[PDB]
């Protein structure tokens, strides 16, 4: 029930008993999303600064926010 760290001259070894849980889990970075988010009014589009609940759409600035709110 006690984990055994055995370090020899040929190499290092860290052994765990079957009773203890496995401390290790394989972790790899997921594939990144290719397209960036864009603004609502599509003469603007830039990475989205904030999301709008009333219009339900993301906007960068209040300028385009007026056009989006007017269109909705």
């Amino acid at each position: 029930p006690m984990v055994r760290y055995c370090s020899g001259a040929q190499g290092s070894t860290l052994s765990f008993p079957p009773g203890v849980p496995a401390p290790t889990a394989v972790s790899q970075r997921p594939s990144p999303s290719g397209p960036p988010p864009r603004c609502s009014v599509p003469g603007c589009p830039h990475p989205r600064r904030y999301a709008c609940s009333r219009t339900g759409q993301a906007l960068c600035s209040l300028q385009c926010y007026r056009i989006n709110l007017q269109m909705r």
Partner: protein
């Protein structure tokens, strides 16, 4: 650009190959004896054969001994350290004068140590707990090594590390894509922060995004760091590590200059001797400068004897603009130049003399060309008459308002009417002093 300094026009001594001093060199004219004497002094500094040598510079005010002393450092270069200190800084409330002078002696001398560094940095592509197969009845599972991936713009590299470091990787927060600092020699693992690539997924996140390091995964570079014996004495004086509660609270307390015992000085001398014997560290001597030496206390004058008799004392230069004066700290004691005869016998005195009117005109021309001001012939003659009448310094100060007023009037060059109006508005020190005598009853 750089603000023009009064001494900024002095680039060095301008010595010849045979040792003689050229008449006009590095913006310095006249004073051949002083420039040659300092020319031997810099040979003593470069030779490093002697220590504790004290030079004295005496003469009337405005003779340029400060320009020569500052020219010494410019002629020597940036390799050897130079520490100008006025005598006014010797008096201090918290730190005693002897500790000030000692810390200056440690400030002059300095060291340079070359060191190589190996660092692994980059974005983490994958982290795997590599499992070798060695089933045993005593303990079921075995893990041989942990593989850590690293990605950089120049290339990607994987590393095989012992599982013991995975205990720290699990002890502190480590996420996919975290840029981390890992040194091979130290073996410690630090977390720099999240990569800038993942900052686009969230509109708001608490973690700051550091960019991915540009370069090879394994970076081994040799850098030479210069650290003075004074810096070593401060680092040895107070602990830098804040792991202790007393180090944290003491770090919260206000720092004050503390008197350093001679034992620490001796230990520094011993370890420095060891590193010099190893040849890894390079030791260079410093050049200590002192201005207004007549302002020192008699206790400092007597302390400079035991300070200079030591073999660790760097070369010290003195500047005294005063003649025979009463020694500070004693009412009835008078000594030439303002220094006691005991230290005055040990120091090497160098005499300086006032410039002739021609040298005044030449220095005025040098300062004019330095500040970028044009002077007409006749106005330069009248200005030389003004400087000869009062002082060179005042004639140097008269250059700026005539240039500004000349630009305002539209003339790109200074004229005799400009220096005449300036000389009429402004008053020289002696003229003002004479005017104060008539109205002194009203003052």
């Amino acid at each position: 650009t750089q603000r023009i300094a009064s001494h900024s026009h002095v680039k060095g001594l301008g010595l010849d190959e045979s040792g003689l001093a050229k008449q006009a060199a590095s913006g310095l004219v006249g004073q051949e004896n002083a420039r040659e004497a300092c020319g031997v002094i810099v040979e003593l500094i470069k030779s490093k054969k002697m220590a504790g040598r004290a030079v004295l510079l005496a003469g009337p005010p405005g003779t340029g001994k400060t320009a020569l002393a500052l020219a010494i450092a410019q002629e020597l270069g940036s390799k050897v350290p130079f520490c100008p200190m006025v005598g006014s800084e010797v008096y201090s409330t918290e730190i005693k004068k002897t500790e000030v002078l000692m810390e200056n002696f440690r400030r002059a001398i300095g060291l340079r140590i070359k060191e190589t560094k190996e660092v692994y940095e980059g974005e983490v592509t994958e982290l795997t707990p590599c499992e070798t197969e060695n089933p045993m009845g005593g303990y079921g599972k075995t893990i041989s090594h942990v593989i850590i991936g690293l990605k950089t713009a120049k290339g990607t590299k994987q590393l095989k590390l012992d599982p013991s470091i995975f205990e720290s990787l699990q002890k502190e927060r480590v996420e996919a894509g975290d840029v981390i600092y890992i040194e091979a020699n130290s073996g410690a693992v630090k977390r720099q922060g999240r990569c800038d690539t993942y900052a686009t997924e969230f509109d708001l996140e608490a973690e700051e995004y550091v960019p991915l390091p540009k370069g090879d995964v394994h970076k081994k570079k040799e850098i030479i760091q210069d650290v003075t014996l004074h810096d070593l004495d401060v680092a040895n004086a107070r602990p830098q590590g804040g792991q202790d509660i007393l180090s944290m609270m003491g770090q919260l307390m206000k720092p004050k200059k503390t008197e350093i015992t001679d034992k620490l000085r001796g230990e520094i001398n011993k370890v420095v001797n060891k590193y010099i014997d190893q040849g890894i560290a390079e030791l260079v001597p410093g050049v200590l400068f002192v201005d207004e030496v007549h302002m020192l206390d008699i206790e400092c004058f007597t302390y400079l004897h035991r300070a200079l008799e030591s073999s660790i004392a760097p070369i010290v230069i003195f500047a005294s603009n005063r003649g025979n004066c009463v020694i500070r700290g004693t009412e009835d004691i008078t000594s030439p130049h303002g220094i006691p005869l005991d230290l005055l016998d040990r120091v090497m005195i160098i005499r300086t003399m006032l410039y002739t009117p021609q040298e005044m005109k030449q220095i005025i021309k040098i300062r004019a060309q330095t500040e970028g001001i044009n002077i007409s012939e006749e106005a330069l003659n009248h200005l030389g008459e003004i400087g000869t009448k009062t002082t060179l310094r005042y004639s140097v100060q008269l250059l700026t308002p005539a240039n500004l007023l000349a630009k305002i009037n539209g003339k790109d060059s200074i004229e005799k009417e400009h220096v005449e109006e300036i000389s009429e508005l402004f008053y020289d020190a002696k003229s003002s002093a004479k005017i104060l005598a008539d109205q002194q009853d009203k003052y």
